[PDB]
Amino acid sequence: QPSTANGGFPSVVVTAVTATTSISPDIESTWKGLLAGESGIHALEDEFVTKWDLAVKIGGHLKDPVDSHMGRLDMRRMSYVQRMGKLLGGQLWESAGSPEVDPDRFAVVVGTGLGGAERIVESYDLMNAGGPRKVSPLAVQMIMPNGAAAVIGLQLGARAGVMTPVSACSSGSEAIAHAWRQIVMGDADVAVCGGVEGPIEALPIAAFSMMRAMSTRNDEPERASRPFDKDRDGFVFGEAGALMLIETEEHAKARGAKPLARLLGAGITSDAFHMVAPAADGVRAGRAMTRSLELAGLSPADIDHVNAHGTATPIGDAAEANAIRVAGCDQAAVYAPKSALGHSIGAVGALESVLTVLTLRDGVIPPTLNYETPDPEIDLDVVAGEPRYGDYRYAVNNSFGFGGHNVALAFGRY
Amino acid sequence: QPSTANGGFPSVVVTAVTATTSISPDIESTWKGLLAGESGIHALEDEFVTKWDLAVKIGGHLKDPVDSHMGRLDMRRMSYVQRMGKLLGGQLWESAGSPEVDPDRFAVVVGTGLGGAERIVESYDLMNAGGPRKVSPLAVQMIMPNGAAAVIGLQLGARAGVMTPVSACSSGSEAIAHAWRQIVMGDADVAVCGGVEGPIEALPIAAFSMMRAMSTRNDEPERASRPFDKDRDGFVFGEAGALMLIETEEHAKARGAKPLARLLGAGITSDAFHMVAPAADGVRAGRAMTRSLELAGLSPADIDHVNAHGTATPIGDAAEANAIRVAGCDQAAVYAPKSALGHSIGAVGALESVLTVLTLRDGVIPPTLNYETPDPEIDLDVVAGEPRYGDYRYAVNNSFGFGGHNVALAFGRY
Numbered sequence: 001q002p003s004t005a006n007g008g009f010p011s012v013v014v015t016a017v018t019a020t021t022s023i024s025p026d027i028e029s030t031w032k033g034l035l036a037g038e039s040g041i042h043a044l045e046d047e048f049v050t051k052w053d054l055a056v057k058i059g060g061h062l063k064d065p066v067d068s069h070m071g072r073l074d075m076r077r078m079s080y081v082q083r084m085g086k087l088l089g090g091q092l093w094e095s096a097g098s099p100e101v102d103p104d105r106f107a108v109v110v111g112t113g114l115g116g117a118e119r120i121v122e123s124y125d126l127m128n129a130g131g132p133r134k135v136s137p138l139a140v141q142m143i144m145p146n147g148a149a150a151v152i153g154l155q156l157g158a159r160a161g162v163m164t165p166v167s168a169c170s171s172g173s174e175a176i177a178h179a180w181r182q183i184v185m186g187d188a189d190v191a192v193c194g195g196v197e198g199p200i201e202a203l204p205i206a207a208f209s210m211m212r213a214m215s216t217r218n219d220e221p222e223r224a225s226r227p228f229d230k231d232r233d234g235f236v237f238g239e240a241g242a243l244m245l246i247e248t249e250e251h252a253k254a255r256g257a258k259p260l261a262r263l264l265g266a267g268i269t270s271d272a273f274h275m276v277a278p279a280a281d282g283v284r285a286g287r288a289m290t291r292s293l294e295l296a297g298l299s300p301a302d303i304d305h306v307n308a309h310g311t312a313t314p315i316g317d318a319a320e321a322n323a324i325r326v327a328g329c330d331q332a333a334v335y336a337p338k339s340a341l342g343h344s345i346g347a348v349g350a351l352e353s354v355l356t357v358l359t360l361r362d363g364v365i366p367p368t369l370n371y372e373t374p375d376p377e378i379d380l381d382v383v384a385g386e387p388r389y390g391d392y393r394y395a396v397n398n399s400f401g402f403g404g405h406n407v408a409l410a411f412g413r414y
Numbered sequence: 415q416p417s418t419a420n421g422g423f424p425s426v427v428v429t430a431v432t433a434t435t436s437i438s439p440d441i442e443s444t445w446k447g448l449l450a451g452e453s454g455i456h457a458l459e460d461e462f463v464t465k466w467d468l469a470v471k472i473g474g475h476l477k478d479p480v481d482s483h484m485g486r487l488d489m490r491r492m493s494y495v496q497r498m499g500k501l502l503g504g505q506l507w508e509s510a511g512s513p514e515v516d517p518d519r520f521a522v523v524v525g526t527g528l529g530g531a532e533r534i535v536e537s538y539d540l541m542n543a544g545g546p547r548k549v550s551p552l553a554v555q556m557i558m559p560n561g562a563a564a565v566i567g568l569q570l571g572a573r574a575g576v577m578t579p580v581s582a583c584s585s586g587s588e589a590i591a592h593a594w595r596q597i598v599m600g601d602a603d604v605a606v607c608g609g610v611e612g613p614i615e616a617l618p619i620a621a622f623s624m625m626r627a628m629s630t631r632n633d634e635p636e637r638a639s640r641p642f643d644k645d646r647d648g649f650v651f652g653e654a655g656a657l658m659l660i661e662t663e664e665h666a667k668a669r670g671a672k673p674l675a676r677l678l679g680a681g682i683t684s685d686a687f688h689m690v691a692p693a694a695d696g697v698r699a700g701r702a703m704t705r706s707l708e709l710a711g712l713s714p715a716d717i718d719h720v721n722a723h724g725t726a727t728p729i730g731d732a733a734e735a736n737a738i739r740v741a742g743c744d745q746a747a748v749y750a751p752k753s754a755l756g757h758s759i760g761a762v763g764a765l766e767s768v769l770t771v772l773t774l775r776d777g778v779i780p781p782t783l784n785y786e787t788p789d790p791e792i793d794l795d796v797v798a799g800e801p802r803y804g805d806y807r808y809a810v811n812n813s814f815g816f817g818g819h820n821v822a823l824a825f826g827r828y
């Protein structure tokens with residue numbers, strides 16, 4: 001049975017990464033800030049907080065707003081997530097040395113949680129105001145959730161598939177999983193993959209708050225996101241988008257690209273348990289980790305590091321602790337980046353996949369912020385206080401999305 | 415290099431199908447009507463046609479509306495596409511003999527074009543009216559585009575992955591492609607797959623009409639959808655949803671299920687050409703057909719039948735004729751079901767995949783309606799007049815979606 005370790009799958013490497021976060025528009029500056037213990041989460045200055053008197057008054061807007069890079073034309077022809085995708089797509093390609101690749105062996109897979117939803121309301125207002133002919137001929141291509149991936153595939157010339165998986169919090173990780181599949185099955189040699197997501201506004205806060213999924217620790221915003229802490233009380237929004245470039249090792253060697261890590265396997269399972277709550281027993285989520293190991297050719301003892309999904313909801317962190325144990329990975333050093341960067345839904349799995357790559361590259365795990373009184377019922381080796389330098393050889397990034405979608409990505413040091 | 419023909423991939427069969435269309439809620443009755451030359455497309459009786467004086471006054475509502483099967487509870491807890499998914503999911507399972515399968519080897523892949531979009535506007539109205547606490551705690555799970563797939567996976571107990579690809583008109587075909595991948599890569603033994611889509615309303619008509627993508631032949635609704643006809647003038651909406659059950663041949667034999675056809679291979683490519691127009695040269699779209707043949711282990715000469723994407727836009731049918739030629743399949747007998755059933759976007763590839771199965775099962779192709787003066791620049795063997803009974807051994811179903819997403823599915827007679 002084929003595996004990465006036994007050569008049954010081609011070797012696939014990560015050759016470039018890009019991300020915009022609440023800490024910085026530069027991924028290497030985000031990484032430096034994480035290591036320094038910085039948080040992207042602050043008091044929301046937006047007028048809409050006072051207008052609605054929202055329960056949640058904290059979150060992390062992008063440090064550098066996407067639209068500060070968008071002129072009038074882009075603001076009229078693209079939804080927000082398309083604008084963010086176009087921005088990250090060009091940054092990534094430049095960071096990769098702007099390679100000339102075969103378009104027919106080049107795929108794009110970019111997940112997102114929702115799509116161009118703000119253009120739905122706008123098109124509906126324009127039609128109420130002025131009739132059907134005041135809907136833009138660009139409305140369909142802006143609204144459609146595949147729009148961000150299509151923009152990037154068109155911008156970079158990808159003709160071996162342009163795909164958009166939608167699985168809430170796991171969308172950006174699942175995109176990297178399907179890009180890995182598209183390469184190992186032979187349909188592509190190189191792929192841009194990741195996730196983009198919209199900004200923090202009042203309706204998103206209201207919608208997730210009404211599930212009691214969100215922290216309300218407004219007095220101390222940087223202390224609010226507390227994954228695996230006894231005093232956690234839900235997640236915090238932190239805006240983000242992230243893409244990575246993956247390609248076969250032979251493709252990378254032939255064009256002089258230095259891999260940052262290896263992408264060794266990917267597991268996708270489902271809870272079939274509840275529409276928003278994860279299964280308490282963590283069994284299917286752990287099975288996604290196991291599956292990524294099977295495809296990589298690893299055993300649980302090889303896993304030095306787990307980049308947790310760790311949203312800091314009470315039930316989510318408890319389910320994930322069971323999953324890590326179920327997968328036999330609970331000796332691994334655990335990092336929960338949402339402690340610092342918050343939750344960006346459809347982008348966050350991609351962002352955390354980039355962070356996992358950087359952990360393997362630099363042999364260091366940033367501290368999980370606000371991990372001060374460890375939850376007694378959770379016994380994980382959570383990195384905290386200051387970065388932990390260590391000999392990390394293999395790592396799993398977890399993403400467990402609303403709807404019960406479990407994605408685990410197995411990465412290796414190059 | 416592995417293929418279905420050389421045993422490199424496990425044999426995968428189609429064991430059950432279900433669909434709701436503008437002709438009938440029963441797939442076998444839809445099939446009978448298609449053979450009899452029936453059209454689902456009629457004059458729209460909806461008040462909103464007069465209210466807005468839409469250019470387009472024709473379309474095919476479902477013969478049996480989804481919500482005539484939905485009580486008060488389902489109407490409050492699910493978006494439309496989730497309600498349609500729940501309806502089709504239960505019908506499919508019953509039609510399959512309600513098998514007991516291993517949940518851990520059971521996947522769901524259901525595409526859709528947009529998602530629970532009507533609940534976005536509703537949640538936003540509820541918040542304007544009564545503040546953030548009058549947004550439902552169910553809003554997130556109703557809005558999220560993965561919601562229909564999650565509903566079906568939860569209803570049927572699928573724990574080997576629940577996935578939602580979004581690729582406009584190719585969403586329902588791409589879902590069947592990823593379900594086939596999930597089985598042949600070893601992650602699952604059985605999968606429910608297909609696509610669901612929302613209903614015809616005024617804003618969707620306005621949005622697609624402003625691209626000049628839609629027929630305006632309101633005087634003769636059943637004559638309006640004219641794929642490959644010289645006098646075509648765009649597509650017609652025809653509501654639909656469709657799912658099929660696929661499983662390994664060994665899984666099917668072990669539980670006494672009679673396969674209706676074989677699912678032999680799937681090709682996914684992209685145009686990277688334009689956000690809504692297909693590439694004129696049809697090259698990448700043809701390459702998707704070729705790729706499905708490579709994975710099946712077939713040559714172009716084996717392809718007896720092509721179930722065309724055939725939307726009846728001027729540029730779309732011309733591009734697809736080039737694609738079929740590029741793929742070496744232009745001796746195949748061509749059917750364009752949108753001539754009778756119209757375009758259901760995210761569901762239509764799944765519906766047409768079911769129709770391809772039935773063509774192989776029954777050795778017959780329904781007539782392409784309204785094919786009366788063949789376009790001189792297109793030279794395809796378009797079935798027309800009355801059904802063509804023939805020895806169809808292998809067939810390709812094409813779906814080429816807005817955004818440049820090309821999916822070809824290779825099917826074989828069982």
Ligand SMILES: CCCCS(=O)(=O)Nc1ccc2cnn(C)c2c1
Binds near residue numbers: 198237
């Ligand atoms: C980290 C913030 C996540 C917010 S969200 O999950 O509700 N996605 C989201 C997606 C698209 C748009 C367009 N406008 N808006 C406001 C959007 C929001």
Ligand SMILES: CCCCS(=O)(=O)Nc1ccc2cnn(C)c2c1
Binds near residue numbers: 112168
């Ligand atoms: C501009 C309208 C925002 C819609 S919302 O406020 O209800 N947020 C939202 C809701 C559901 C999902 C699933 N994925 N994602 C990202 C979501 C986001």
Ligand SMILES: CCCCS(=O)(=O)Nc1ccc2cnn(C)c2c1
Binds near residue numbers: 529611
């Ligand atoms: C065959 C009709 C296709 C219409 S459409 O492409 O615009 N999809 C669509 C999807 C969801 C909803 C919810 N309400 N409405 C009106 C919807 C419409």
Ligand SMILES: CCCCS(=O)(=O)Nc1ccc2cnn(C)c2c1
Binds near residue numbers: 143528760
């Ligand atoms: C209830 C709001 C309807 C939004 S709409 O009228 O603009 N139609 C619409 C627009 C884009 C896409 C992509 N896929 N699909 C299916 C789509 C459908």
Ligand code: NA
Binds near residue numbers: 307352353
């Ligand atoms: Na993670």
Ligand code: NA
Binds near residue numbers: 721766811812813
């Ligand atoms: Na077709």
